[PDB]
mmCIF file of C-alpha atoms and ligand atoms in Angstrom:
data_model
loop_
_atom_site.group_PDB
_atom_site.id
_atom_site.type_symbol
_atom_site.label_atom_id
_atom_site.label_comp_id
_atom_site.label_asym_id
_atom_site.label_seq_id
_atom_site.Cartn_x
_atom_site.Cartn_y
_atom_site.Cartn_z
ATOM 1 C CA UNK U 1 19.646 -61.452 -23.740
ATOM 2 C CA UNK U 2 15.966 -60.954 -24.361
ATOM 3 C CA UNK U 3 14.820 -57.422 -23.612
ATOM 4 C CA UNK U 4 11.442 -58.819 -23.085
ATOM 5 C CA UNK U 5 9.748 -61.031 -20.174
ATOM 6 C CA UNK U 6 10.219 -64.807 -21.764
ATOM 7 C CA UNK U 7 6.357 -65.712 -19.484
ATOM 8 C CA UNK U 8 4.661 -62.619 -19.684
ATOM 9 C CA UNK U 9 6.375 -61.157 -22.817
ATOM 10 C CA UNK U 10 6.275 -57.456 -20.947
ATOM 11 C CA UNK U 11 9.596 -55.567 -20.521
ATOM 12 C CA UNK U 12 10.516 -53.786 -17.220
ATOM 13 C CA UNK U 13 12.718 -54.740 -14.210
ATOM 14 C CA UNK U 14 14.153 -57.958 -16.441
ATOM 15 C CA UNK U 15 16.956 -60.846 -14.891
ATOM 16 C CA UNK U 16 18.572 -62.292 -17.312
ATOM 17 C CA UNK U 17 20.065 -65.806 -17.707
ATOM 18 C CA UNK U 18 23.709 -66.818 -17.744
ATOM 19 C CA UNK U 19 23.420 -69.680 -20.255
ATOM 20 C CA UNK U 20 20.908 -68.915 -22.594
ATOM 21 C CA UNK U 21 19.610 -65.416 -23.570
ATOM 22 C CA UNK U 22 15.884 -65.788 -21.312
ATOM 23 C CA UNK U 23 15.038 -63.050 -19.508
ATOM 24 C CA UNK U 24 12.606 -62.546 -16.282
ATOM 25 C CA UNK U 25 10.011 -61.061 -14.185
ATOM 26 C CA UNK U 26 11.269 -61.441 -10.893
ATOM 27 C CA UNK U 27 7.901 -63.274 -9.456
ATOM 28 C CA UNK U 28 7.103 -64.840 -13.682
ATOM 29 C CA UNK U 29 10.158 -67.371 -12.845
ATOM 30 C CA UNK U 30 9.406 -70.149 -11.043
ATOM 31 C CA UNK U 31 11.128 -70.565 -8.671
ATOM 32 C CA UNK U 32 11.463 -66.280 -8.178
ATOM 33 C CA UNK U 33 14.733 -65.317 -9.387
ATOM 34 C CA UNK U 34 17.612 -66.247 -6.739
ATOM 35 C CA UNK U 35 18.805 -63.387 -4.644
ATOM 36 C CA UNK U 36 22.279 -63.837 -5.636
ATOM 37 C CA UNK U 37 24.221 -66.449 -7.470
ATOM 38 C CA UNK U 38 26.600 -65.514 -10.259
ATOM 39 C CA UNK U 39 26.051 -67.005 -13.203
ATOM 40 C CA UNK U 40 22.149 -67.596 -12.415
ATOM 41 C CA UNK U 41 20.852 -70.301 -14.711
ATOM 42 C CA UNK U 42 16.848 -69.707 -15.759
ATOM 43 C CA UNK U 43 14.538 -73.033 -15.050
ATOM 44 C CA UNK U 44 14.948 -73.816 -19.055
ATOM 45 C CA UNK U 45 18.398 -74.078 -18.999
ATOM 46 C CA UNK U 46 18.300 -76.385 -15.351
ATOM 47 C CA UNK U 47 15.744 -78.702 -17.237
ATOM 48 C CA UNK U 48 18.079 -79.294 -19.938
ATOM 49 C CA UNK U 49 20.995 -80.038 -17.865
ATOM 50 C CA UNK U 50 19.058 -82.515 -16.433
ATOM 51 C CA UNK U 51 18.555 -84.159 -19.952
ATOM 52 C CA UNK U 52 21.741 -84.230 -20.527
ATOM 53 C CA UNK U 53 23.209 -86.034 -17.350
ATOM 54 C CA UNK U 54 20.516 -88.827 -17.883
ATOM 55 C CA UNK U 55 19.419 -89.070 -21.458
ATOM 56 C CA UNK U 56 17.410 -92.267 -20.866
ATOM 57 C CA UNK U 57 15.157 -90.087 -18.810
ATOM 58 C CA UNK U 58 13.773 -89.239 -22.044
ATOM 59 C CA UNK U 59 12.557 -92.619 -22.792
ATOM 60 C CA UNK U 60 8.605 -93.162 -22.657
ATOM 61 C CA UNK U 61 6.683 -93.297 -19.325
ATOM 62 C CA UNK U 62 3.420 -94.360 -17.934
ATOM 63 C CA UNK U 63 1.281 -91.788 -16.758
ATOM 64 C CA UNK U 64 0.515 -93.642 -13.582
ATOM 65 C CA UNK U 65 4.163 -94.281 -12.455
ATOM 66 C CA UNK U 66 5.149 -90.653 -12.750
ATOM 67 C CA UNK U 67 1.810 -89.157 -10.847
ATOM 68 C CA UNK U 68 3.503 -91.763 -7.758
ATOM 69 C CA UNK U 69 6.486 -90.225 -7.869
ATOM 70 C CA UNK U 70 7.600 -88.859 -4.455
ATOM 71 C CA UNK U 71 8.257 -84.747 -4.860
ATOM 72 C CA UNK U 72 12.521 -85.117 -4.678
ATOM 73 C CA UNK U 73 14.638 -82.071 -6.107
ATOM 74 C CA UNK U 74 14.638 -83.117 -9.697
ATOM 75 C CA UNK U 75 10.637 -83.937 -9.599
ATOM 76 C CA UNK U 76 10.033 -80.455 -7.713
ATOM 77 C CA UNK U 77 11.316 -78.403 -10.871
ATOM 78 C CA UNK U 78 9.645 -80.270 -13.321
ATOM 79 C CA UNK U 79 6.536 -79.467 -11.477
ATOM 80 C CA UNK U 80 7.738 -75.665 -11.118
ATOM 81 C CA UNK U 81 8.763 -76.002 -14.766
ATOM 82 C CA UNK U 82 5.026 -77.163 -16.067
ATOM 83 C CA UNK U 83 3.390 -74.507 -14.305
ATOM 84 C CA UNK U 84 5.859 -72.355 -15.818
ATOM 85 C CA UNK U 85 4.943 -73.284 -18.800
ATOM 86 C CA UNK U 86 0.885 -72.506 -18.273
ATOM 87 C CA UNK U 87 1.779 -68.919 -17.227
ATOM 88 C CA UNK U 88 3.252 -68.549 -20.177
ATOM 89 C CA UNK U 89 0.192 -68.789 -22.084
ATOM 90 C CA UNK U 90 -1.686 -65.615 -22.305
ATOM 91 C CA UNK U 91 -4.671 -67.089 -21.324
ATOM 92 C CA UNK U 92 -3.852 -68.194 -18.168
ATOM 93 C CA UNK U 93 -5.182 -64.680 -16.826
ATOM 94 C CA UNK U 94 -8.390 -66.081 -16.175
ATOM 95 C CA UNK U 95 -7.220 -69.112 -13.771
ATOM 96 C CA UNK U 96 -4.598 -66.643 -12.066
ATOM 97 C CA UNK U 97 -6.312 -65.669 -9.232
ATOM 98 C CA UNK U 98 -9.114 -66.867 -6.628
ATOM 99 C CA UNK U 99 -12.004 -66.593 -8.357
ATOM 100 C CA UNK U 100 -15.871 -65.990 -7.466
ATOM 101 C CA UNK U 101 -19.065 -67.683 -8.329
ATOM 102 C CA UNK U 102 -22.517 -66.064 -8.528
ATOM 103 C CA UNK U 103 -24.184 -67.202 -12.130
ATOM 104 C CA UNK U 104 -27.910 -67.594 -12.477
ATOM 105 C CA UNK U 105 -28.137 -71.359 -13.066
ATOM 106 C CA UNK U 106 -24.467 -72.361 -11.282
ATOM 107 C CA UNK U 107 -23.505 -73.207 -8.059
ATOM 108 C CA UNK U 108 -19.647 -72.532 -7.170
ATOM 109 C CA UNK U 109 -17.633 -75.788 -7.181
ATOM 110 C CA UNK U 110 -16.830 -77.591 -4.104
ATOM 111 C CA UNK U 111 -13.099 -76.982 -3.633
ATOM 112 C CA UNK U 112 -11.955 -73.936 -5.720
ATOM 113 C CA UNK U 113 -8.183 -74.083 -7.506
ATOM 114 C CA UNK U 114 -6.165 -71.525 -9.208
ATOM 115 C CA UNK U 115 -2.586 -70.561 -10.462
ATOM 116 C CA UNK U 116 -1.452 -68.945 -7.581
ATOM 117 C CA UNK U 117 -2.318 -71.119 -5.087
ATOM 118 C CA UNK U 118 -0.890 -73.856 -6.763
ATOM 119 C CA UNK U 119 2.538 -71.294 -6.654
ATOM 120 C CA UNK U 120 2.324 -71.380 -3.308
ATOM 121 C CA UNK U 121 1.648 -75.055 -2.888
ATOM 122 C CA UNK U 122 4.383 -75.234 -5.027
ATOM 123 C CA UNK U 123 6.921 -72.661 -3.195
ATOM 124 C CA UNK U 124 6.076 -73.798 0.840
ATOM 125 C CA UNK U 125 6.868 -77.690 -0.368
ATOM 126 C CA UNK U 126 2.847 -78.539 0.026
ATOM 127 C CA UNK U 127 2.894 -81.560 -2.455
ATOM 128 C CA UNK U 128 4.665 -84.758 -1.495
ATOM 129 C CA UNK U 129 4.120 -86.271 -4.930
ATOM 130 C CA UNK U 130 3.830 -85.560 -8.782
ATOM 131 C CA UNK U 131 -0.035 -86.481 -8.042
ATOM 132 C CA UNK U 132 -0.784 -83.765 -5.474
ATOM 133 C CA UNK U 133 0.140 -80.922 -8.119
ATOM 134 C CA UNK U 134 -1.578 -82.376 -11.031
ATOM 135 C CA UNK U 135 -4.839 -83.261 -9.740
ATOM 136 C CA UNK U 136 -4.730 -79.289 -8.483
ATOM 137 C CA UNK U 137 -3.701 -78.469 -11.680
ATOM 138 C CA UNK U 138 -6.341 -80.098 -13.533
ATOM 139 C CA UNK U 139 -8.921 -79.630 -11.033
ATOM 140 C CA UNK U 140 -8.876 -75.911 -11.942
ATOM 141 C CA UNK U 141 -9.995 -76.477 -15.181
ATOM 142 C CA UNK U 142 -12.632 -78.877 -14.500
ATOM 143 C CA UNK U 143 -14.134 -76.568 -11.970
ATOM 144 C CA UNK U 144 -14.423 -73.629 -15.022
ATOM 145 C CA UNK U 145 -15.983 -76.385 -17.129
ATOM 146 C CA UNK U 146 -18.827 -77.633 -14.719
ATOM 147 C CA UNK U 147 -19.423 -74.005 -13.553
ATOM 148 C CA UNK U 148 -19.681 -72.245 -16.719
ATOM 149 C CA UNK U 149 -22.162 -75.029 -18.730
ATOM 150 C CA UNK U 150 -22.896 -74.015 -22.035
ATOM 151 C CA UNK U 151 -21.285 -70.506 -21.900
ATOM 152 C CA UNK U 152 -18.793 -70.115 -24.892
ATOM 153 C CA UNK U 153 -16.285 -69.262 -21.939
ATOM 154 C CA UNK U 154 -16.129 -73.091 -21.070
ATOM 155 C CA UNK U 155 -13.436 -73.162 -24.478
ATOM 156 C CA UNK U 156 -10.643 -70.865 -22.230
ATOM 157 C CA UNK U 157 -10.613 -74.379 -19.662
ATOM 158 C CA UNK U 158 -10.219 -76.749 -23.009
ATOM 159 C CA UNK U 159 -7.813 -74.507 -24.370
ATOM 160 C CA UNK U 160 -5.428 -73.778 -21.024
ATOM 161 C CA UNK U 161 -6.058 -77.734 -20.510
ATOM 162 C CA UNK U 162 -4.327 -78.271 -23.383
ATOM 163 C CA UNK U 163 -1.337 -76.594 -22.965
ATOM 164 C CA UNK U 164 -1.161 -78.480 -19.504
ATOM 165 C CA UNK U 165 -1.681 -81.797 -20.939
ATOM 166 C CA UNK U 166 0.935 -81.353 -23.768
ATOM 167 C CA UNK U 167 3.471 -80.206 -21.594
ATOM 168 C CA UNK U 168 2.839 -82.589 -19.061
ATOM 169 C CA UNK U 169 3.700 -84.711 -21.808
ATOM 170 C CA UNK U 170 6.673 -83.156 -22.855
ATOM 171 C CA UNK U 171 8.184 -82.671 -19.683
ATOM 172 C CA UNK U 172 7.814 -86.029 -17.737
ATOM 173 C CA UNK U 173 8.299 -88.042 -21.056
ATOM 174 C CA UNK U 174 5.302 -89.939 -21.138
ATOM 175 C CA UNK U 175 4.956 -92.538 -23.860
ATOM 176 C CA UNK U 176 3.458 -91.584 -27.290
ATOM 177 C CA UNK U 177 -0.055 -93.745 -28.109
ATOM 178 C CA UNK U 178 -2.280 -92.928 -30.802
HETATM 179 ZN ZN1 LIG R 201 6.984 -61.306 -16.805
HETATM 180 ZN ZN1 LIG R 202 18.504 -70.048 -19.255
HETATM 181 ZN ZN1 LIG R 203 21.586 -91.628 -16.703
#
């Protein structure tokens, strides 16, 4: 196994995976590493196996069919999955926690977002489809770009948005397009 934090890339109090050599943060999996079950399979290895039962769901997908989705098991982890997959990025620091507004020439925006309370969302079963999570998701980054203007700090949005995006991608197999 890894001896280092696969999200966070920090050693410490590490669980490791049964099928692949991933190792964890207790609370940097998502879902938080299971209480008990021997062999424990990491969130990686759960999205492959679901790749492998149904290989067609690989296959291109519109965008707007798979924000309609209803939030069943198998949707549920991608979602866990994606936001997985922002953590991972060291820049999602800045859209971790609640954040405050009080900039001369900005006014806060109108329904704040951020990481963690999308976790929660997340973990109490808040969203009932694909849409609910991804509109959260990229309403935190639109928030940091209307709020911050012209400040150089606007790029950290763009580039966290990105990572999103092409993940999003990735994950729920939308169709290529130039
Ligand atoms: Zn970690
Ligand atoms: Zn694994
Ligand atoms: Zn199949």
């Amino acid at each position: 196994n890894s001896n280092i934090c696969e999200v966070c890339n920090k050693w410490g109090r590490l669980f490791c995976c049964d099928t692949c050599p991933r190792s964890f943060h207790e609370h940097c999996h998502i879902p938080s590493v299971e209480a008990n079950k021997n062999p424990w399979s990491c969130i990686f290895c759960r999205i492959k196996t679901i790749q492998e039962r149904c290989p067609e769901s690989q296959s291109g997908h519109q965008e707007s069919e798979v924000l309609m989705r209803q939030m069943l098991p198998e949707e549920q982890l991608k979602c866990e999955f994606l936001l997985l997959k922002v953590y991972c990025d060291s820049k999602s620091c800045f859209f971790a926690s609640e954040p405050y507004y009080n900039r001369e020439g900005s006014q806060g925006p109108q329904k704040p977002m951020w990481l963690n309370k999308v976790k929660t969302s997340l973990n109490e079963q808040m969203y009932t489809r694909v849409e609910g999570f991804v509109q959260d998701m990229r309403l935190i980054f639109h928030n940091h770009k209307e709020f911050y203007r012209e400040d150089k700090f606007t790029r950290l949005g763009i580039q966290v948005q990105d990572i999103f995006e092409k993940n999003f991608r990735n994950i729920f197999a939308i169709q290529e397009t130039s």
